[PDB]
Symmetry: C3
């Protein structure tokens, strides 16, 4: 699956400096090799953020205490309960018909109030997390044979590595997220985590609060009061909303949390590598035979807004795969945008291709091998 460095990808200076440009997409590998030196495998190993900050916590199922009521007769003042003016409570004030039937001197409306301590049922929280674009780590690894590690972030872009035989190598890597972080929120339950849209998450009609806060806001979204009955007032629990939520999350890309690491499954790093006094071994792929392809794995949803596929090649390896795509009715405009920097068929493997396509009806072409693909439009959620 590793690719070999191409001549066009590096420049050799007059004073002995060699500048190599690499594009490493998550799970992509490139093998670089200098004359008289062991081939090195370089690849972006992971992209993640350690425990990203918690934003809102939504209550999916309220937990109400027994109801507390307070009534007054048509002459005694207004009714009151300690619970009014306390956190974590939902209250309703009203008037009820009073008379001799219920211990009152006069006939008439009496002041009545009902409160309830509203908390969330254990394990019934939906917590949202936000990424800090500058805290997302992109880990690159270098290892002998066609072992060192270096991590970058938007803020940390330059490093120096000692690759033995290669000496001191300067690594300048421009990091790039495959997800629009600003518009993203990781929804988590106590599939338990999903990658949802900021706007969708913010408008969820549920009680909410920040971590640390003890009481909930808009608790009345799950707690309603009924009409008063002289000296009683019913309270309604709108029930558990987990079902409705899971139904809405159907099909939404899941978040991949490993321990405390919140992984992104899409993205890349493009680095400029600086080497001294040595000769890089180039290589220039030839175009693969346009007719010796077969679908090893037909185009399918990658699980993160992209299309992946695998082809099998019977021709002479290694070679560059000819990939292109068209939008139904426009056979002259290539609309395929590859995530895979250099799709190739090697001797050990290759044939994997990841790309982005315009929404609608498309036809993917790997040489003469074709296959149609429907790209759903963008949405923030149900």
């Amino acid at each position: 699956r590793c690719t070999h460095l191409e001549n066009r990808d590096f420049v050799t200076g007059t004073q002995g400096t060699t500048r190599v440009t690499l594009v490493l997409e998550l799970g992509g590998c490139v093998t670089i090799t200098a004359e008289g030196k062991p081939s090195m495998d370089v690849w972006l190993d992971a992209i993640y953020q350690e425990n990203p900050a918690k934003t809102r916590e939504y209550c999916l199922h309220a937990k109400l205490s027994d109801t507390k009521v307070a009534a007054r007769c048509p002459t005694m003042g207004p009714a009151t309960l300690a619970e009014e003016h306390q956190g974590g409570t939902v209250c309703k004030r009203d008037q009820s018909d009073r008379g001799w039937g219920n211990h009152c001197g006069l006939f008439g409306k009496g002041s009545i109030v009902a409160c309830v301590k509203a908390a969330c049922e254990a394990k019934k929280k939906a917590t949202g997390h936000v990424y800090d674009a500058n805290k997302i780590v992109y880990t690159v690894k270098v290892e002998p044979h066609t072992r060192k590690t270096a991590s970058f972030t938007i803020s940390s872009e330059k490093t120096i590595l000692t690759m033995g035989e290669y000496g001191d190598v300067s690594l300048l890597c421009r990091v790039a997220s495959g997800v629009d972080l600003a518009q993203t929120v990781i929804l988590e339950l106590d599939p338990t985590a999903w990658q949802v849209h900021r706007d969708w998450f913010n408008d969820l009609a549920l009680p909410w609060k920040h971590e640390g806060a003890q009481n909930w806001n808009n608790a009345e979204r799950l707690v309603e009061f009924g009409a008063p009955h002289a000296v009683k007032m019913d309270v309604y629990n709108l029930g558990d909303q987990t079902g409705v939520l899971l139904k809405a999350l159907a099909g939404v890309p899941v978040a991949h949390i490993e321990g405390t690491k919140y992984h992104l499954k899409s993205g890349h790093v493009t680095c400029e590598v600086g080497l001294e006094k040595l000769k890089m071994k180039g290589l220039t792929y030839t175009m693969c035979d346009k007719t010796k392809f077969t679908w090893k794995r037909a185009p399918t949803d990658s699980g993160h807004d992209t299309v992946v596929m695998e082809v099998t090649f019977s021709g002479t390896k290694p070679c560059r795969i000819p990939v292109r795509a068209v939008a139904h009715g426009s056979p002259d405009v290539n609309v395929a945008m590859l995530i895979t920097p250099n799709p190739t068929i090697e001797n050990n493997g290759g044939g994997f291709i990841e790309m982005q396509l315009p929404p609608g009806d498309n036809i993917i072409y790997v040489g003469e091998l074709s296959h149609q693909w429907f790209q759903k439009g963008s949405s923030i959620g149900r």
Copy 2:
């Protein structure tokens, strides 16, 4: 009006590789040429996203049904209506005065409640759309004579093109939006100029109107357009606050319009900076000379570009081609150049040129194209009215 590749913009290696760096702003072109080969024109043709996701839908003018009221005598329990527990309904509960005048045994307060179904009048929605930074396409084009296409995104940055005489050239383009997408929202009204605007996230979110998501049947905060009157024994009135379109259109005055072409939501600002890798060939350089600082005239004076930048065109009477000396200063600080050009390399060619786009600090500035000057006032940043 294309520009010619300069020597400083490319390096030729010892093993025969040539690395070319290009900056292509939307609408900008660069002509590259190699010995014994046809000159190629390279440019950023368009930047856009196909059907961006819909966020909120705002109701500009409510459409109510028929009011429904229910009352009870000072002894009959509380009044109730079915609508009280249904979607798409706005209700109000209160206490009214009842006596013999209205068919009640006793004199006193009696329960009463009114409800109405609230929907939005057809073609009276304001819909917001959000861009997906990673789904914005930057289409670069290559064509002979001083034709191929390649599109890039934040995620898709590398490609290989076969440009005939030039062979296989690698294209590595770093995409860059000219608009802060995270803080942007495209506001749109229903079909049946202008009908779409580029508004600020924070402004959009705080609009005081009823709203809902596409697909949802009912509206939230429907009472922002529906208000109930005081109760009258056995009647209670329901008010509709009217069409807010006028108010909104007023607030959108001067706001940059969105350019929607079919399903394509275009950005009118941005650029791509690419590194082009070519093998075994000889790049023809070229190095412009400063234009005569005194042979300039305003073909089109500095003006708002329509997308938070200043544009202008100058005429040159000297010997072409040459590089235009552009700079600007903030009134009172004639030593600091505050002009930041969007136009990578402003030049006067033989076929044309003379166009310049740039950003300037807010306040009073003076633009200088050689000795030709012109004042310009830059308004500060705002999220809208």
Copy 3:
């Protein structure tokens, strides 16, 4: 604290073009020098935006003016007040007990409503500002001796400079913010009352503040009832409570949050860098290649500490032979084989004139920073949007 250009950082072409790559963090300098030419100092001088747009204004202390009350007897219809249908007013409707004790014919509940005008106390606003990623300026400066200026933005990346001796050099600088702008809001209190008065807060924290709010230009406030509570009615009176000044509660919450550095109309960012590709013609670049510093001649001049903007900073002292590159690494307690240190400082070195400064980001939790054999423990607090 300038560093010298290294050989690996530049390529000299066959036709005489030299391509130089520089990484300039805010406050970082790099000295470049060519054969028979004066050394030039190049650095990122400042990062800022001139007067960012205002978003929400929050009221910290309401100015309630008068309490209008209106009542009715058990038979006269509902009570009403003009203020009930005006902006800038908080109203409450209820029912009171009426009889002969209070001028009413019958005994029973009577309509009653109370309203109060609501504005904000002078100088008691909390205003939010939003940055415009494309309007943040990154100013680079070039000056002789180991003076010109060039500013860049996400949109303005290319420039041509005339550095005399060096001639016309092309500058291509890719700008990069050290702050997640989309998730940032500058919270500001009415200056001239404490001249910190500005903070760099999280948008999700800012948006959820439970206070009355409005946009600049708007005359009235939204959710004014967040600072006004009504009491129970008493026949023909109803009290109105001002929930009081919230300034204290807020300042308490901002404790520890990074301050925003405003200088005049310039809202400065204190983190971020620029990486440029410099293009030079016909000249020969003087390289230089640092040697690793003596792994044992280091001492803490300033131990690892919070930088004030989400990073760790430190300074060491070197007694060995200068100049040299500092060996910096860090490990997450229990994994002595993985370097988790991410340097903000592009090339940490000990020069003759100075050096020794190091800025870096570390994973949350317990870490051990290693500058050679010199070590030091560091606890990194996790991410949060605020209290």
